[PDB]
Symmetry: C3
Subunit: 34 residues, 3 copies
């Protein structure tokens, strides 16, 4: 159903944001060490 899809999408995008933020923070730290 539509409402279920929308909830799934919010969870997916939330997880993607989390993973991207972790990557960005780690990449910042590596860049600072070169």
């Amino acid at each position: 159903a539509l409402n279920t899809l929308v909830k799934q999408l919010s969870s997916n995008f939330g997880a993607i944001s989390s993973v991207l933020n972790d990557i960005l923070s780690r990449l910042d730290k590596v860049e600072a060490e070169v």
Copy 2:
């Protein structure tokens, strides 16, 4: 309605592509320094 959802999704996916591209670009550069 559906049109609103599709526009929101399109915007979300565009932002994710932009961020991924920036990360890939930055990773390429760091890999060259280590």
Copy 3:
């Protein structure tokens, strides 16, 4: 909503693939600094 769901599945699969490649590459650089 079959068409949209199929498109979304494809997009999310591609994102997971790209994220995995990034995480692998990031792990290696962290080990090399």
